[PDB]
RNA sequence: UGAGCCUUGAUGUGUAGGAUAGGUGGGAGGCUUUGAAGUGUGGACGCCAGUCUGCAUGGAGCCGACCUUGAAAUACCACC
RNA sequence: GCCCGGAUAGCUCAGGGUAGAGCAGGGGAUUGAAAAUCCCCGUGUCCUUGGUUCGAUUCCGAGUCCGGGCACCA
RNA sequence: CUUGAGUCUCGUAGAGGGGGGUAGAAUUCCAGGUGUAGCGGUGAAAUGCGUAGAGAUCUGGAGGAAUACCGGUGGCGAAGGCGGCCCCCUGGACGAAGACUGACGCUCAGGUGCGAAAGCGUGGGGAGCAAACAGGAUUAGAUACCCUGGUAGUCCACGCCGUAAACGAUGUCGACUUGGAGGUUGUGCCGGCGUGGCUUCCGGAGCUAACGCGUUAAGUCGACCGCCUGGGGAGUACGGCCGCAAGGUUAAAACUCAAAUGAAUUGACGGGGGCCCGCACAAGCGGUGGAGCAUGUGGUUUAAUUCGAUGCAACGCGA
């Protein structure tokens, strides 16, 4: 549908899904998977084998765009920050570029109240 | 933790030095610190048996 | 146990063919200690399926076993109340004993004559795939394939 | 940017089968140096098996009835 | 009375050369349990009848029933 | 009279206090572009959001609150407490040399002032969090722990309240009495040699019921103040004073018990930690629980159904 060649990844990995996007430089997103839609429900859906299933998944969802440059930004700290990157490389991409852009702040608002469990 | 991959060097090894990076830079620790509020109590209470259990 | 010091006890081979595999066969197939009984079972059994075969007895026995041989199983393991059902590696030695378990196993429960008729039956089912133990070989696989996530 | 409206060019491998052949049809001559069998190459489509398609080299052949089908070969042609 | 759409599994339901997806229920790997997983299993003239066609769940007619807008409403 | 106490000259360090301005990261909301079937949450789920286009991603705007790294048993303050950067106003501490006054000092009933958080009144503000409240779970029940929401409050100005495990559970002031390892901040002489202030850890004599304290004393002494007299009743009732209220402060009696209590010792136990062993689990094989009969027991029946064992460690047991 276009031909764009070089686009940027995101991934948001926290500790109960991981989601996986495409898009190009300016910020306009094309393919999109995630580790709860690829079949894995409850705690299966929090682990590092899910988080590359759907970068695999992703990555076979944007076919149609002739990707042949990736960078990468990662924020979060689920289990699914490597495995990820990983099933990325190997589907035949070019990792130019990683990035951690996780927020941090630099005092900001109260946190909730810790669990008594 | 912005690793720039340089020429022909191979994937493992730029990963290996973008999880170095973000080890040396305290992400995940800091992340996890701010999960949940801890009193100022809580805080001196700790640091202070941290320091007597280190000495 | 908790010593680690256990060994490993040795087999008698089979009288006309040599092979401590037909040996521990026979093994899996004896009860009661009656081992004369069953030597005659598993001898009529591979002699009908070396003639309806017409390869031997020995080829066509290890071929109809490799059907039957998981390379992977499950294992339980606690860790917070729910238990993980993680995918492990399978010994060859337990691969064949398995083999060998599911195969008698398998052999008894059919509706046929006599034992040797079942088991040579079951035993061919097996050498081209539409026995009830190729059927839990892939039970098995399938089981262990689908929590391949708890793989650590 | 919607709806109808003409013209063109494609588009349609239940199973037969060289053939990704719809209903219908005057009907086996067109095509051909108005550079043609077969090619390198541009490209389309595709139940991906195969249909469609410019140029170049090349130089002039493919060809209708033929046996399988319910039917013939877009050989021109016309009805949907 | 007329017109407009429908009739498919036990339920919900998409679909001229076929009957299809999920859950309901049954057993077993399965553990003390709902999990949670694996394994299959059925579950059918595709409302009825008739009509074209090389045969129609598919196109056509007449019927049984559901819903909507109308009309008759003296 | 000058040694206690105070004034003056130069300087050092510091989240000490009051007022105003500003910066960056992030959460939330608002509008728009891309894009499509999930997101969120948990031990597992469900409530909740989403095809009316969510979650993800990019651009612009609004608003409030707190200041990552530095950061440290580091520093400042009588205590409560104080943490981005900048300016204005302002209190105390310490250091080196000299000069000045001349006992001007210490403690303090009643009195006065400051005093975390929650709470109260009036007027603003409201992003995040979150009593009460609502729903979803778990459970024999769950007015809880867990999940999704969520109002006072948390923030600002002024005025009340006057309480905390407000703790070093250690009142203030002064003198004397072996050592070691550090931290922080001044200063003299030549990286070494000294000399002041505050502060952390160990330890000697001594003291203590013991634990322990130990030049920053819980050691040896002096001055002044506050407080205690068995455990419940009770820091409660009545009265006085203070407050808008919540309540604060002063503070009994009848009745009842023979104890209540502190430190340490030996075991036992822990849904505390470490290391080990046993057919104790895990891997297998064969059984019992169903059927028929044998045998023992409980119960019921009988004139008697003789007596004993009767959780594991009694029940084919004395027999
Ligand atoms: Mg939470
Ligand atoms: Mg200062
Ligand atoms: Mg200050
Ligand atoms: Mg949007
Ligand atoms: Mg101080
Ligand atoms: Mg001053
Ligand atoms: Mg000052
Ligand atoms: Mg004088
Ligand atoms: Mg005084
Ligand atoms: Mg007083
Ligand atoms: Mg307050
Ligand atoms: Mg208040
Ligand atoms: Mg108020
Ligand atoms: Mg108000
Ligand atoms: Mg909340
Ligand atoms: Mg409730
Ligand atoms: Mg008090
Ligand atoms: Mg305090
Ligand atoms: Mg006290
Ligand atoms: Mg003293
Ligand atoms: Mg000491
Ligand atoms: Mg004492
Ligand atoms: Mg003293
Ligand atoms: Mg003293
Ligand atoms: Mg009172
Ligand atoms: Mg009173
Ligand atoms: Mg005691
Ligand atoms: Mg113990
Ligand atoms: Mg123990
Ligand atoms: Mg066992
Ligand atoms: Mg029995
Ligand atoms: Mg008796
Ligand atoms: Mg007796
Ligand atoms: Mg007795
Ligand atoms: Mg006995």
């Known amino acids: 549908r276009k031909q764009v060649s070089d686009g940027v990844a995101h991934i948001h990995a926290s500790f109960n899904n991981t989601i996986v996007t495409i898009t190009d430089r300016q910020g306009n997103a094309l393919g999109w998977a995630t580790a709860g839609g690829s079949g894995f429900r409850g705690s299966r859906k929090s682990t590092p084998f899910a988080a590359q299933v759907a970068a695999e998944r992703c990555a076979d969802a944007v076919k149609e765009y002739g990707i042949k440059n990736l960078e990468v930004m990662v924020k979060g700290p689920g289990p699914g920050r490597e495995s990820t990157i990983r099933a990325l490389n190997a589907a035949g991409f070019r990792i130019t570029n990683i990035t951690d852009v996780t927020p941090i702040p630099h005092x900001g608002c109260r946190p909730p109240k810790k669990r008594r469990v | 933790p912005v690793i720039k991959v340089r020429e022909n060097e191979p994937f493992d090894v730029a990963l290996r030095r973008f999880k170095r990076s973000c080890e040396k830079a305290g992400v995940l620790a800091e992340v996890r610190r701010r999960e949940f509020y801890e009193k100022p109590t809580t805080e001196r209470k700790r640091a202070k048996a941290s320091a007597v259990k280190r000495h | ?152």
């Open chain 3, 1 to 152: 146990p908790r010593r680690r010091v256990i060994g490993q006890r040795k087999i008698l081979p089979d009288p006309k063919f040599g092979s401590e595999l037909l040996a521990k066969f026979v093994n899996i197939l004896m009860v009661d200690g009656k081992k004369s009984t069953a030597e005659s079972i598993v001898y009529s059994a591979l002699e009908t399926l070396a003639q309806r075969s017409g390869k031997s007895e020995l080829e066509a026995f290890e071929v109809a076993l490799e059907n039957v041989r998981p390379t992977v199983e499950v294992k339980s393991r606690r860790v917070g109340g729910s238990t993980y059902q993680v995918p492990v590696e399978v010994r060859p030695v337990r691969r064949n004993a398995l083999a060998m378990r599911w195969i008698v196993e398998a052999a008894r429960k059919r509706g046929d004559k006599s034992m040797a008729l079942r088991l040579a039956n079951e035993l061919s089912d097996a050498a081209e795939n539409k026995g009830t133990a190729v059927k839990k070989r892939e039970d098995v696989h399938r089981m262990a394939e689908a929590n391949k996530a708890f793989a650590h």
